[PDB]
Amino acid sequence: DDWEIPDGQITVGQRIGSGSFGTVYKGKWHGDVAVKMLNVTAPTPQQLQAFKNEVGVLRKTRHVNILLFMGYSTKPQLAIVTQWCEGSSLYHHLHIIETKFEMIKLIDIARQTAQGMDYLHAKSIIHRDLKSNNIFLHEDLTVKIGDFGLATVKSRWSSGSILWMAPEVIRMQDKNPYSFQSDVYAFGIVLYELMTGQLPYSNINNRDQIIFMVGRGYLSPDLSKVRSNCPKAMKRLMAECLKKKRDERPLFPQILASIELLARSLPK
């Protein structure tokens, strides 16, 4: 049963992981691994059980598009270990190395990512912070969605990502704004990243202004910066995913359907 990895087995190496939510190290354990050390100090069994609890959510995931969870650690520190993806994250491709994909690929990356979420949603998991940074890109062919773990551990132990936030999320309204449709909107944003190779609202220099405006639905993404080689009913789908009221957003089965439809409507 238990997925714990005893001390000394894992061999930590190069550093890459930033943030106060945890530090990611490249490692070696039955091959190259990724290790996210939770960068706490030494928390008390009320917290330990809460970690064990978040793992219990991860092991529910077995899907080519979901980043592979391989085991957790405790004795050196609290840790989650995953497969190591060679190649770079989606945010890196579009926004740092300016990688121009064929339109066929862009549509595919979408399909896979949508595929990944439909799964997560079927197993009652809300990603809550899907963004192109969390969409890893293996051997430059396969989509691997990460960072959906540890939702509990953010609230129990008290920036960025605002671009992906649906209105209801942005305006920090009630205690639970996070829904499936919450994630769909964040998807809509990556759809806009793919089709325009650009972050939205890049012509507004004051963050709080974005935040206020998105939350009140005064400013939404500029769909007209899609390239010409992009399909007509791609715009329609982004529009669907990006709706201000969350009811109007389609769920992933239906999104997926619309992508498969337009995907195999392109090569001819």
Ligand SMILES: CCCS(=O)(=O)Nc1ccc(F)c(C(=O)Nc2cnc3n[nH]c(OC)c3c2)c1F
């Ligand atoms: C899979 C479910 C567990 S989770 O907590 O949702 N996500 C989760 C947990 C632990 C990790 F190390 C990671 C992670 O970012 N891994 C990771 C894996 N391979 C990489 N190649 N290049 C990178 O960047 C340079 C990588 C980063 C992760 F995304």
